[PDB]
Design a protein around this nucleic acid. Structure first.
Lengths: 246, 224, 134, 200, 185
RNA sequence: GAAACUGCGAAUGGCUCAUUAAAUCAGUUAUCGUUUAUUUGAUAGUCAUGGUAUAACUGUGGUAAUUCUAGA
């Protein structure tokens, strides 16, 4: 191609999206936004294929013009808005909230969420830097750019952010024996507490994690996402608690 | 110049002031297959199950929990009359628009069921209602304006005879909102009391009109 | 003998769409293929609603017959229905009117002609009129 | 003159009766009675008279009838409605006449009055079938013989007090009026082994 | 472009196309179960080949291996859910022992002939294509249904059929019409 | 609301594998050696408001002819 493409095949979609082969040749190519391409979800696939409330693009389009849903308080009117993991979805006329969070089945997962939990949101600080005029700041995993954070925080760090001000509620460091979500990889969604971290200078650092059934596995730090302390999640968790069984 | 030549698209922008200018009240100049007018178990209960189907707002769901525990019949209305009305006005001053449409509808059918004995509730209901109108003016909802004044015309149609006997007091209950310095508020209240005026009989007409004359010379300053 | 029983399943209110979605299940024993107008009538009566706000579609009688299943919708009023429904269904229910137009072919070649046309063209018409007069 | 006013008036008479009955039991509870009406409309097991009964003094009375091999009996008890307030019975001369409808293998349905609890059930009326309701075709879906012709087995009175249905080994369901015991309709089962067992 | 809809040939030709023993096998089974087609025989035998092949694979697999346990359970439960494998025969040797005659019995035309709703197996297939018997509530005009146990209890005539249900057919009604016409004449 | 100016797209889609034998492709990198329209999130104290136009349009024209144009 002599540039980017506007087109997305049916089979070209990520497998976790659970979209059939037969009701289309095309998947809706998601627009650019916070998250990256394969670990997102368009809102129309969210609504029609999970919430089932609309069945057509004209329907969901009319809804977006009806200005209902606010993602983190902000409405989008984009159909293919790239909604990713750990997201707050606010439903006014139905009076609900939804945390978008990975499935034990490796898929995504809606979560029925109250207003107090929707008031804030979580974020993996991925890069702390020093900006122009010597201003210190961070960029999270969801692309939130926050000036002037607490100096004790470093990269990859879990931060509770109030959405209502878009401000740093509090933070959680990266220690062993912290409750961690795994975002990507084969074992994603399997919530566990970190055993430790095999570190490599310049290399992909591996992480050993043990979960409640005393089961240990190893993923990469990119998949690693700390939630909270032991028995202390800052969020409400869905059924199964991220536990793989037979 | 307003919009006289309708374009082809299905969706006009339709600003709030234009909505206000197009809005009218009278359901008799309207009509429909009203559910309370359609099934005749109880009007309040019919409207309540209808809005229990329709509305999904947390204010109204807590309200509906309490009231669907309380009342399931017309003797239960006649028994727990006060408590359900106090919970009504509680959520009414809890001020949720999503619950404000169905709660106003249940207020209307609650008066339609409780007619002749409602007036004691109905007076401070007028008070809280005009407070809610001022709250909508702080807000910006032609829908809420429409719901409130439709409820007002409903209560007038339901309780006409006692109010055409006691007409000049009902005027006094709305005079601060008739003399309120908003032309469309005055217009809507004028439409509702105008329905009542066209309903009222001749003796009460002459009495009420003469008292309006003296009220005019009292408020000789006001032009609204 | 024959009793058209109109039943529903999976009823969800969509207040965002200000309607109710439900799977319609028709039992018409000693009967075949009752019409959607009557179905909308009975459904509007059952849900205390108005037939124009009621919409039914996509119906399939089972193998053999006597039972049909499809899908139905009822908006909270005629205004919701009019503002939300597909126009072909609105025409199908008579609410909208079938627009008349040229074919896609006539429209295509017409657009091509007018696309080769530049400007408004009345000046061109006067010029070619006087040139044919020449 | 208005139906809402009439409903309210019936509710006024209802609550007057409720408060007078409250004064009678006295010689809260009214709302408890309202909740009892709602539980009657729908509820779990609420009638808790499992200890107030006096079984040792329960007066017994056997009634031998001429008809042989009784199969079923259906009692109609008219109850006062909660939403409307007239009755569940249809007529005015009934006024809550407790009815019984017995079907016996001699092809006989018999209605009794059981309106009193000290007297005996009075044989109000009857209707008996026979072999003249034997059908002519014997091989078709049509079984519209107005009377039964073989081995009635079960009966059920409609709750509105208008009709009574009967079914038996002649694979038919004949519904009759409850006063004249006239066959208002008959539904064949359109079967070879579709014999009526029990009604609900 | 689209997605390729997956499909399959449901059968396979035998190795030697001509052998007297198998020919008489086929003739006996065909006139036995009212059948009509070598290709149908190839279908059912192909099913048996696949199933007992995978069965032998499980036999070669090691005992108490969870894959073996899982697959044996699934195969056995599907067999007994159809009604082929019996309750007492719930082991892999019996799964190896299952046979095309059992499958031909579990076929529906055989089963309704056992139920005696037709004088012949062929007569049963006739009634099948006349659509006069519904299974459970569902009318089926396919004689090769391979029913389950509940369903073979649930075999009954069609309520639209003139036999177990609705009005008689066109032949009966036209003969009654001509007979009424002649008697009124 | 024609037309016209302005904006953006028109660097995808669809068709074919001519060519090409460490080339592509595949896996595995990495760019602390590059730019990024767009999305998104942040981000700026350091005249009661000049001018030039030109389309569209009016009007005169060319030719055998084109989604040609010229003058004004």
């Amino acid at each position: 191609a002599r540039g980017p493409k506007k087109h997305l095949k049916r089979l070209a979609a990520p497998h976790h999206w659970l979209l059939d082969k037969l009701s289309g040749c095309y998947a809706p190519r998601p627009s650019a936004g916070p998250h990256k391409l394969r670990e997102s979800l368009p809102l129309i696939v969210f609504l029609r294929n999970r919430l089932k409330y609309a069945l057509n693009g004209r329907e969901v389009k009319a809804i977006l013009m009806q200005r209902h849903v606010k993602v983190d308080g902000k409405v989008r009117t984009d159909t293919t808005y790239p909604a990713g993991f750990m997201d707050v979805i606010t439903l006014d006329a139905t009076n609900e909230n939804f945390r978008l969070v990975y499935d034990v089945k490796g898929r995504f997962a809606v979560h029925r969420i109250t207003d107090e939990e929707a008031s804030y949101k979580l974020g993996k600080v991925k890069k702390v830097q020093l900006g122009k005029k010597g201003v210190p700041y961070v960029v999270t995993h969801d692309g939130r750019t926050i000036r002037y954070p607490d100096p004790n925080i470093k990269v990859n760090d879990t931060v509770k952010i109030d959405l209502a001000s878009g401000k740093i509620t509090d933070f959680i460091k990266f220690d062993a024996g912290k409750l961690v979500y795994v975002t990507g990889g084969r074992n994603l969604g399997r919530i566990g507490t970190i055993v430790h971290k095999e570190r490599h200078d310049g290399g992909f650092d591996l992480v050993h994690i043990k979960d409640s059934l005393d089961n240990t596995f190893v993923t990469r730090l990119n998949n690693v996402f700390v939630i909270g302390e032991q028995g202390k999640p800052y969020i409400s968790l869905p059924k199964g608690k991220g536990i793989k069984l037979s | 110049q307003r919009q006289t030549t309708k374009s082809s698209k299905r969706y006009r922008y339709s600003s709030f002031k234009a909505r206000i200018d197009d809005l009218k009240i009278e359901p008799a100049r309207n009509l429909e297959k009203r559910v309370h007018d359609y099934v005749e178990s109880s009007h309040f209960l019919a409207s309540f199950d209808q809005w229990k189907e329709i509305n999904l707002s947390a204010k109204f769901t807590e309200f509906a929990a309490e009231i669907e525990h309380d009342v399931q019949t017309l003797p239960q209305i006649l028994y727990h009359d006060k408590k359900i009305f106090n919970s009504l006005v509680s959520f009414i001053n809890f001020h949720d628009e999503f619950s404000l449409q169905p709660l106003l509808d249940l207020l209307a059918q609650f008066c339609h069921d409780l007619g002749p004995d409602f007036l004691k509730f109905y007076e401070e209901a007028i008070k809280t209602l005009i407070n809610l109108l001022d709250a909508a003016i702080e807000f910006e909802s032609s829908n809420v304006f429409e719901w409130g004044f439709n409820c007002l015309a409903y209560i007038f149609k339901y309780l006409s005879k006692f109010l055409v006997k006691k007409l000049v007091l009902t005027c006094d209950l709305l005079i601060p909102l008739l003399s309120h310095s908003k032309e469309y508020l005055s217009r809507f209240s004028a439409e509702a009391l105008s329905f009542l005026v066209r309903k009222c009989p001749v003796s009460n007409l002459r009495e009420f009109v003469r008292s309006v004359f003296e009220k005019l010379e009292g408020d000789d300053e006001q032009t609204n | 003998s024959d009793a058209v029983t109109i039943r529903t399943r999976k009823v969800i209110s969509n207040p965002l769409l200000a309607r109710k979605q439900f799977v319609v299940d028709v039992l018409h024993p000693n009967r075949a293929n009752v019409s959607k107008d009557e179905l909308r009538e009975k459904l509007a009566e059952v849900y205390k609603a108005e037939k124009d706000a009621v919409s039914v579609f996509g119906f399939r009688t089972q193998f053999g017959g006597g039972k049909s299943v499809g899908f139905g919708l009822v908006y909270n009023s005629v205004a919701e229905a009019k503002k939300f429904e597909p126009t072909y269904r609105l025409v199908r229910y008579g609410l909208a009117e079938k627009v008349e137009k040229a074919s896609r072919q006539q429209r295509k070649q017409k657009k091509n002609r007018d696309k080769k046309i530049f400007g408004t063209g009345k000046r061109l018409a006067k010029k070619v009129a006087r040139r044919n007069a020449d | 003159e208005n139906p809402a006013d009439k409903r309210r008036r019936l509710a006024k008479q209802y609550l007057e009766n409720l408060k007078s009955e409250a004064n009678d039991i006295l010689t809260d509870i009214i709302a408890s009675r309202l909740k009892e009406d709602v539980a009657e409309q729908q509820g779990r097991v609420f009638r808790y008279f499992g200890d107030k009964l006096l079984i040792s003094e329960a007066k017994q009375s056997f009634t031998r009838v001429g008809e042989n091999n009784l199969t079923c009996i259906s009692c109609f008890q008219p109850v006062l409605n909660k939403y409307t307030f007239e009755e569940s019975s249809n007529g005015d001369k009934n006024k809550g006449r407790l009815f019984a409808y017995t079907v016996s293998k001699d092809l006989q349905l018999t209605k009794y009055d059981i309106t009193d609890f000290s007297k005996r059930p009075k044989k109000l009326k009857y209707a008996k079938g026979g072999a003249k309701y034997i059908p002519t075709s014997k091989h078709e879906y049509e079984n519209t013989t107005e009377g039964h012709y073989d081995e009635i087995l079960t009966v059920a009175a409609s709750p509105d007090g208008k009709y009574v249905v009967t079914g038996g080994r002649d694979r038919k369901l004949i519904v009759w009026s409850t006063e004249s015991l006239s066959p208002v309709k008959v539904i064949p089962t359109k079967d070879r082994r579709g014999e009526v067992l029990s009604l609900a | 472009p689209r997605a390729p809809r997956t499909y399959s040939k449901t059968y396979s030709t035998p190795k030697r196309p001509y052998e007297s023993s198998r020919l008489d096998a086929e003739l006996k089974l065909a006139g036995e179960f009212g059948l009509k087609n070598k290709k149908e025989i190839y279908r059912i035998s192909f099913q048996l080949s696949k199933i007992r092949r995978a069965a032998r694979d499980l036999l070669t697999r090691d005992e108490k291996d969870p894959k073996r346990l899982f697959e044996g359970n699934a195969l056995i439960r599907r067999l007994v859910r159809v009604g082929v494998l019996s309750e007492d025969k719930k082991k892999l040797d019996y799964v190896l022992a299952l046979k095309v005659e059992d499958f031909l019995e579990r076929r529906l035309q055989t089963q309704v002939y056992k139920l005696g709703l037709a004088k012949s197996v062929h007569h049963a297939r006739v009634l099948i294509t006349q659509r006069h018997i519904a299974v459970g509530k569902q009318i089926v005009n396919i004689p090769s249904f391979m029913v389950r146990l509940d369903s073979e209890k649930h075999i009954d005539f069609a309520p639209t059929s003139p036999f177990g249900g609705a009005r008689p057919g066109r032949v009966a009604r036209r003969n009654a019409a001509r007979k009424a016409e002649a008697s009124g004449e």
